[PDB]
Amino acid sequence: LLRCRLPGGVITTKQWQAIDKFAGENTIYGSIRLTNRQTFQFHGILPVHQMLHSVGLDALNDMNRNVLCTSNPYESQLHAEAYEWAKKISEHLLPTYLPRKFKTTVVIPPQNDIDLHANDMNFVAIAENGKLVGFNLLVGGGLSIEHGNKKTYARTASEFGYLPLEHTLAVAEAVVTTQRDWGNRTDRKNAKTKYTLERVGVETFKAEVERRAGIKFEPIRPYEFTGRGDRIGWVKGIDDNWHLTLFIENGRILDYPARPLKTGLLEIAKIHKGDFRITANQNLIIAGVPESEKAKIEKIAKESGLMNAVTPQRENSMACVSFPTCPLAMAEAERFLPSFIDNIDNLMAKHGVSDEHIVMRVTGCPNGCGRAMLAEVGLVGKAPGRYNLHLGGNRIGTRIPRMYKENITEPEILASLDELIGRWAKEREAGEGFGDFTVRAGIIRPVLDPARDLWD
């Protein structure tokens, strides 16, 4: 197992060709696994660094994880700046020992594709006249929990305030350091920033941060999110540039019977003029496509089975790696999801909601890599074929879903959803998402204060 440090998910066609070669040539699985933190994973490496190094990549003692960045912003121009700043925060933070691991992101409203609430440090971009002017800082998100341990909990990030662009690295560093010092010294389950903030208090942590930075935060600047999904298909970029976002189930890239997904990608990488971007949804964007080249690029993806139509539901569903490679797995995730979404699609069609979607995620074990804890409907692995069903999150990802049922099987899970999806389909209001309806209809109480009311 090895994972590369790829800030913002941006990788070159040249780098893509090198890892494709390594994937198939020197690993047991021969696949390329796009992760939900905008990077890739090789499984079963039987040198990796010399090849990484040769193409300019490094595989991060260091508790710093991959820094994310909105991959395909509605205002296409803001990306490059947001991206330059994701790459700087990532280099500035490179080695102070952190009690636990730290996750950071650069978010471009109104897209929360990078699921900011699962992260320790979040820089939410504020722009004027197509120009970034600063960042709204959000601190304290974290999803991991322990089955039956009411002292562990998932938490959403808290707003600290606004700060001008010039004070970005000083803040990122003070946050990191106040965590480094204030993180719990005994146990590692209470180390997380979400825990420290709850122990000292958000204002207390905030002041140390201001004190350490040498600044005083400004009031939070207006921002809202409209979704967390990728823009599957083509979108107009900047100038004559076009963007093709390819859906990749579980982000597992491999050639399949009649579906040369991996070869399709190498063939695309050979002709593509710009680079690629790995999304926070385990998909891939072919960036910087001149209008002239669209026919060429699309034909290849069409050929390889990379543009195969799937329902909106499957486009908005995600699962962690889990079995067979994860030694912490309790129940399948990646290998369970396709079949499960088939079963879900059927139920959505049964209720006249086929054109709709529910943010549905499957996490293998309670560590939470599948981000089911920010899902409208989450599945939390407990045992072989057994999961805890959570409900009540929203489309944008600012609400943690309370456990609705515990230790049940797929058939039991399916029956519970058949029932409620039906309810929602006949009783929801105008454009009312699933999680919201389950909170409005009394199906489940909402988690209003994580550290205190998540658990029943």
Ligand code: SRM
């Ligand atoms: C590949 C990926 C999930 C996916 O299907 O895409 C993944 C897979 C694993 N993560 Fe993760 N996590 C991934 C995103 C996440 C996320 C979600 C996110 O960051 O967006 C979380 C949730 C937020 C959080 O951290 O609170 C997450 C929470 C964990 C943790 C629990 C962390 C904690 O604070 O307790 C562990 C276990 C640990 O570190 O003790 C874990 C451990 C693991 C391990 C390495 C298991 C291990 O330690 O042996 C997994 C290996 C499977 C394999 O063989 O490949 N992984 N992990 C992601 C790797 C991301 C990356 O590129 O760096």
Ligand code: SF4
């Ligand atoms: S959630 Fe658990 S099963 Fe899934 S990849 Fe993370 S550690 Fe493994």
Ligand SMILES: [K+]
């Ligand atoms: K995906």
